[PDB]
Amino acid sequence: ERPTFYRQELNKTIWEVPERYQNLSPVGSGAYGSVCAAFDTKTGHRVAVKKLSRPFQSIIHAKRTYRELRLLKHMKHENVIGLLDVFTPARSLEEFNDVYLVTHLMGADLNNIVKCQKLTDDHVQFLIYQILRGLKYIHSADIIHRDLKPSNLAVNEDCELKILDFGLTRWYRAPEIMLNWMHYNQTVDIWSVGCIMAELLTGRTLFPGTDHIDQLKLILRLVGTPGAELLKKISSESARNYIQSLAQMPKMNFANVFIGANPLAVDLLEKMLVLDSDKRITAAQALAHAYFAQYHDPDDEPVADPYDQSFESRDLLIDEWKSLTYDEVISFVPPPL
Ligand SMILES: C[S@](=O)c1ccc(-c2nc(-c3ccc(F)cc3)c(-c3ccncc3)[nH]2)cc1
Ligand SMILES: [Mg+2]
Ligand SMILES: [Mg+2]
Numbered sequence: 001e002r003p004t005f006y007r008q009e010l011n012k013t014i015w016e017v018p019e020r021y022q023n024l025s026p027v028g029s030g031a032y033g034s035v036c037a038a039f040d041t042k043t044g045h046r047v048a049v050k051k052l053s054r055p056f057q058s059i060i061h062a063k064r065t066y067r068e069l070r071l072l073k074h075m076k077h078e079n080v081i082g083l084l085d086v087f088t089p090a091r092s093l094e095e096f097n098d099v100y101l102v103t104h105l106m107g108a109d110l111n112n113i114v115k116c117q118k119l120t121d122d123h124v125q126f127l128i129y130q131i132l133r134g135l136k137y138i139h140s141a142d143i144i145h146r147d148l149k150p151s152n153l154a155v156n157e158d159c160e161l162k163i164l165d166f167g168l169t170r171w172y173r174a175p176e177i178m179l180n181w182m183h184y185n186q187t188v189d190i191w192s193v194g195c196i197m198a199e200l201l202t203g204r205t206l207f208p209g210t211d212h213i214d215q216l217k218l219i220l221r222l223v224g225t226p227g228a229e230l231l232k233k234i235s236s237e238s239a240r241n242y243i244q245s246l247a248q249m250p251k252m253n254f255a256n257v258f259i260g261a262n263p264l265a266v267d268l269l270e271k272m273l274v275l276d277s278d279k280r281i282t283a284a285q286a287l288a289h290a291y292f293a294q295y296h297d298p299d300d301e302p303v304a305d306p307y308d309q310s311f312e313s314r315d316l317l318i319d320e321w322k323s324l325t326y327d328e329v330i331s332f333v334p335p336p337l
């Protein structure tokens, strides 16, 4: 059975949602799409409704629409955006051109944290803990975020944190994906967490590059130029030539860079901000670091069910992706409240 939909216009955007969703209010817009806060009369909960922008403009867009829905239908973890609902006003595949996603409303993100701020910076411990707990789950299913930044980490008034916009500026980007030295593994997201943790402790962007060249220069100033064992592993000759053409920079003492920060924080930052992705701490390892002694519980840091990413290698028409997306909308089952 299909519920009753109602139509309204907000910021030059048509919203057509089921009547259970009331008091739609814009909170966000951009390339990623448009988001309204609403009230869900069924649950009694405050929700965020996202309308995808131009979901089927190109094969690239249509495949991205499919990828987002598949990723969001998979995530069942306290520190990762979960789907309460997905719908289209469309009555059949033929007039399917709009997709709406629904999740629990989150008031803020890591750019604007005040309701969490305390003198001892014990809030940093809890926020990074929740990021690592979410990344452990995502990483266990072979999902890498790749673009983690403060604006992608949503925060409640309770200071509960969730990762969103995953599996899909340059300040938080790992050196190896900015260029493509050794390709990349899951630890590209641990680099980003390092940069975020650094920014929460100091109040400044760790590495605010103006371009890719300035960005790499700011990074090598802290971590130092690659050693013998790292140079050996760069398969790109363009990258390897550039690194070696620069003057040698030493690795700095982090204790002096992050002066007066918690020495357990400085030690974790040293394990996260290593050039060589093979020796960078993993999310599972970082959770067991003494910095998180108060929060860490090995029996409450769950892993994900296996995730079928075979679709990623497939080359289909806009209409094939659109039909595959329509099937995922129909087969959706909300979590048992
Ligand atoms: C990449 S840019 O920084 C960016 C920031 C936020 C979002 C963004 N996407 C969502 C969002 C909402 C509903 C969904 F079903 C899925 C995602 C939210 C959201 C969720 C809950 N409460 C408030 C806002 N924020 C997307 C892109
Ligand atoms: Mg890597
Ligand atoms: Mg900093």
Ligand SMILES: [Mg+2]
Residues within 6 Å of the ligand: 135, 136, 139, 140, 282, 283, 284, 285
């Ligand atoms: Mg891990």
